[PDB]
């Protein structure tokens, strides 16, 4: 028996063993998140401890079959992902050092409290206390107080921890034969040994920078119009040529400019399409929402939801004494078991969230037939992208009218169109520079290109130059403002949101051409179109079995990420913005700061 | 007249594991076969050769009742000329099979919150089974070239694997009780003229 055949037998043992052990970990995790008790915390931990231990044992055994002697690629994939040492390439001491650092940064982010001056008892946490301020407040000094207090009382705690976390994570990565820890994250997109579908770790950097160059014009005009509208609101706080103050962006980091809509709305007399009043008018409940989501997927030739889905999910808040973690999530417990956890309410936003989460499920049912190790999105951005394009088609007036929530006596006019695209752009476009800028800074720290003594100097030089955003208070090297963001201090790769956004419009553009949709891309609903459905299903069922370059070709027909459909979606806005900025300055000077 | 003890086969408290499938020979009795067909209580009822319509008139030497438990997706393997981990390593039907396959979902009985590990199957075997062969061995499967010394090790696995039936499983993963009826026609008495 060859090294390949023994491996085919070793994977056979693993796949059956892991499947039941993962099902037991996931099931305990569900009984806690739906029933927050102390006994369910211990049972979630013991079952999660057993699952983590099984993997570490199998990862060691899988390392005993050398990949060099394997040729069947669908086996080398299952072997490689299992052999990934991760932190287990370090010494027991350095792994224990690193995991303690990872916890303290997580504890500091979550328990970080800031207390207002002259009352050391009226303290606030980030969530909800500080987040409420950064999202709703229009007072400059209150918003300024939260922004700085958060970074000064909590970010500084993280600065020494992050310094030692970069040295260790680079050590782990360099021991896994990567350049640095940033090169290690870029490994998510790597593809080798497939003639015509390969993709290198450095190729991601070049592709991100390249596609970002084409987003720049749209962002500059959106930046110039947001500045112009904010300037009217805060006349003595915003320069007509300078960057935007970081505490005035609608949240704590300026990740999403969504909450600026109230001041930047182009036509503030035409109301939003809020079909929520029509949902209460028609006595809808949570089940009706998800039933209507089911009919959507069925309309395009997808399978309906399993009986176990309707019986096991938690689509309504358990209320009363039984407490639950209300964050919407989709659950692929394996073994024919699929669920959705969601404290749904009769609103339009939850109606759209139901379509976003049931999309994750259809992705999970499609690749369920794959081996255990390949039951995931083609890459990190695939899973999140498929979920977003559901809310796109579902939210259109073409679709909301077809399901009886929007009056047929409502017709889309070119003003509400611009209102819509602007609010989408505030959320979709604004985060693209924030995300590229953040991850580029991290890639440069890991690569060594940023000395410890210029960490915050380069963070804000790159906020001004790339994002067009300037810090309202000068920060020395005792701060750690990137780590004041959840993903940074909790060790998550951030480029997944950049590619996801570019993906989700490539998807939506190809499905809307399959569905033979006519008109602007943003008006498209892929309902009742089984041609579109078949074109997406050919990729969903792949899971991780094939390179993400090929899986992407099955939906769109292109082997690589591409920003054009994103621009295509937004062109009606882009044309209107350029006309609004004819008598305004488009661009920003990086030397201006609000502290003179 | 003797009534054929079918109430014992279908209504048994506990079925056998598919690797150790259970056979019960039926002889010298009367089988009102039509009761089983007409009863709307079975999900799979496909017969091969004989006809289930109303052929409870023909005589047979011996009738063999084989009963085990498998998961719902594997029911397709209980058919002539099928491939799979059940049809190759646990319970194989010949190409010329003459008889019937009866199956029903037993999630209320054989599933337990937390997992019922009573039922097993064989996951590895040196070779495929002959039709109607049974292997209950517990010898450690040698996957590599190093002898296993009777203990689980590298390239040395225990050959039988458990199901773990939980009531929340998808139907493709839920317990199904199977009953396979073989109809022997030797040049012999013919003692089972059910009607
Ligand atoms: C959750 O566990 C508590 C025990 O603290 C129990 O009172 C309650 O019935 C459980 N909820 C469910 C849905 O089983
Ligand atoms: C790879 O192995 C699987 C079984 O493990 C087999 O079904 C598949 O055809 C193989 N592919 C190639 C190209 O040999
Ligand atoms: C995994 O760790 C082992 C040490 O136990 C080492 O042989 C191997 O180089 C490591 N593999 C990778 C890919 O870093
Ligand atoms: C799903 O569709 C099948 C038909 O293919 C039907 O038997 C089943 O009842 C349907 N279930 C739901 C919840 O739509
Ligand atoms: C199984 O038990 C039920 C309940 O008494 C009975 O009506 C049925 O006939 C039994 N099955 C057979 C095959 O006799």
Author numbering:
A (entry chain A): 19 to 614
B (entry chain B): 333 to 527
Give sentences from the paper:
S is a large type-1 transmembrane glycoprotein that assembles into homo-trimers (Walls et al., 2020), which decorate the outer surface of coronaviruses. S1 is responsible for target cell engagement, while S2 completes membrane fusion, allowing the viral RNA access to the host cell cytoplasm, where viral replication can begin. S1 contains an N-terminal domain (NTD) and receptor-binding domain (RBD). The RBD interacts with the cellular receptor angiotensin converting enzyme 2 (ACE2), which is expressed on diverse cell types, including cells in the upper and lower respiratory tracts, allowing SARS-CoV-2 to cause respiratory infection.
